[model samples]
Target: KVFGRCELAAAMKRHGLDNYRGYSLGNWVCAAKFESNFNTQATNRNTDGSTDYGILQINSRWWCNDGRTPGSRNLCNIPCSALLSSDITASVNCAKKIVSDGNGMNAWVAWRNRCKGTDVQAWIRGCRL
Candidate 1:
């Protein structure tokens, strides 16, 4: 569970996106990091490999086996196993497509609504997407 601000920032930089100053990238990263430690190799089992798979913690085994492919799936199809591989932008974009289409600012609106106690601005700055 080592995923943190560094991972989020690396991903954002790879995508040519601006740093997370007040955008949704930070919130999105927080959710994914919280959910899967930002580890692309993360997986779970409802009943062995027949049920879960992939990064962003997607359950590929149940949704679609071919979901890992670019056109077949979303994002760039940069396999979950290779998520942390130097090209983190590809992985982050992939997750963004599935989560918020790289427009994390919109996602922040929803996040703030849900988590009332957190400092939205500070959280966004800390991650710097």
Candidate 2:
């Protein structure tokens, strides 16, 4: 576990993602909570034959390679294993790609479904700028 939802929000805001390009700290925290439960070790296989890795549940088809998946785009050019660790720099950077490359937070299915238009005040409770 890297951080609680609130702590994650604080860190995300510190990284210049508080309302960055239409993304709020709450957007990051909420998606991280539901997608990976704040666990860097998190991964999931979706029904679409794609595997989501790390705190953002980033899909292997576009982000990283697990070496187990064949013919992956590996857009971030980082190993999938790199994401499932305590350090989140690589994951955060790759997540920025998703956010900035014309998709915004919609790159994350969890964010689109759960965090979009949702009241995220609770995700940042007790966290200060």
Candidate 3:
């Protein structure tokens, strides 16, 4: 079953992705599994806290007005409603921006390569809302 708004918010908060599309949970979950095995606390050594954080692993500290500090301004601060918004494409576009800006979906692609095997493309294709 899909997680509720409050449940998802708590999940996002735990994973440091407070800023996310609630309606995109399925897609986000798919992406997270493909990217980090759905590890909410996942972290990369190369990440200077500027990119790729938590499930659905977003990177773009610059865009996250919240400071990098643990409780400070970060992607985790953005509400699910805000992330989802009225535009369905917004979430995908936002993810694309972070993926592109961070370079080839570095972390996301890597995760996909490892976990998804040869079904990565198909998996993403099927994840469409």
Candidate 4:
């Protein structure tokens, strides 16, 4: 499922991402915009044989076990397939686990370069958070 910007924002907010781990909901919204365009089924294969999955693009190399990536840590202890579901609960949970592990939102390069140090409030401006 591909979500509208506000639609994704609202879903994330409900999952406790508003100001989660010092990053604003807007920042997370911005991350999703660049990483996967709010598409639940989004996937990107990397040269390292890793694949990013789901709306937040959680990577199989470190976060999920896709059974394809060599030496996957499965740090989130979830199947990579879980991230591709239309229900984002698992994805959101994995995202929070990533943050809680001290990586912060900078764990995602897109967030570091695109969503970081910017006025991202516009990302969720129309959302009724």
Candidate 5:
């Protein structure tokens, strides 16, 4: 499912992402916009053969187990396929874990390139959350 901007914002807010780890809701929304364009099934294969999964693009190399990435830690203890569900619960949980692990929002390159240190308020400007 591809979420509308406010839809994604509301969902993340319900999952406690509004000010997670000091990052604003807009920051997360902006990352999702650039990372996967708010699409639940988005996946990107890395040159090293690891794959990113779901809306947040949680990676297979260290976060989720895809049964293909070399030395995957499966830190999220979830099948990478689980992140593709329309529910988005697993994806949100995994993303929180990634942030809690000391990576902050910088774990996503898209966040760094596009959402970090910028005026991302527009991403959630119309969201009622």
Candidate 6:
């Protein structure tokens, strides 16, 4: 929870998350803000008995091993808890791989529900990356 909007941008940038895979950094930033408020330890249990983890909020059903989640897909080949670190390295890597699966940012429900059709540019506005 140490990262604010600006610091998250810089960290994501240093992790090479800027303008990755045809999406703008603003999109990623906006997604993170709405999804987890840039907090890596964020976890939300879904109504469907699933859980989302980390900055990008990847689901346990298809992304990582959480032990508590039954039948995890482990698509990212990393423990879900690893994603909940202050350092976003694992989350960014998983997000890039997921977004590259031809789903774009739609992989994150927040992006589809909250961030779509907005001037995402404003997310990064006034931030010196």
> By the TM-score metric, which is better: model 1 or model 6?
6
Per-residue lDDT for 1-129 in model 3, tens only? Answer: 233334443453444332343222333444556555644444442345444444454544543332343433444345333342322233444564564454544446654555433443333343222
- Tens digit of per-residue lDDT, candidate 6, span 1-129: 647887888888898878798777888889998888877888999887889988888999988988887765899999989999877889888888898888788888889999899898888888999
Tens-digit lDDT track of model 1 for 11-127: 565674444344444455555544455565566654443323333554443233434433333234444455545445544555445445454433333344543345433445644
Query: TM-scores across all candidates?
Result: 0.49, 0.89, 0.37, 0.96, 0.96, 0.93
The true-versus-predicted C-alpha distance at residue 113 of model 4, in Å, is: 1.0
Model 6 residue runs over 4 Å out of place are none
| Stretches > 4 Å off in candidate 4 | none
Using lDDT as the yardstick, the better of models 5 and 6 is: 5
RMSD of 6: 1.2
Q: Rate the local accuracy (lDDT) of all candidates.
A: 0.47, 0.81, 0.42, 0.91, 0.90, 0.86
Each prediction's RMSD over C-alphas, in Å, is 6.1, 1.6, 9.6, 0.9, 0.8, 1.2
- Of candidate 1, the 10-residue stretch with the lowest lDDT total is 66-75
| Model 5 per-residue lDDT tens digits across residues 21-98 | 888899989999999999999999999999988998988889888888877788889999999999988998888889
Separately for all candidates shown, the number of backbone clashes (residues 3 or more apart, or on different chains) is 3, 0, 4, 0, 0, 0
Please give the lDDT score for candidate 2: 0.81
Task: Output the TM-score of candidate 5.
Answer: 0.96
**Candidates ranked by TM-score:** 5, 4, 6, 2, 1, 3
**Deviation in angstroms for 28 in model 5?**
0.7
Deviation from native of the Cα of residue 121 in model 5, angstroms:
1.2
- Candidate 4 lDDT tens digits, 77-117: 99999999998899999999998887788889999999888
Top candidate by lDDT: 4
- Look at candidate 5 and give me any clashing residue pairs: none
Model 6 residue 94 lDDT? 89
Clashing pairs in 3: 18-76, 52-59, 66-73, 67-73
Runs in model 5 deviating more than 4 A are none
Model 3's TM-score against the true structure: 0.37
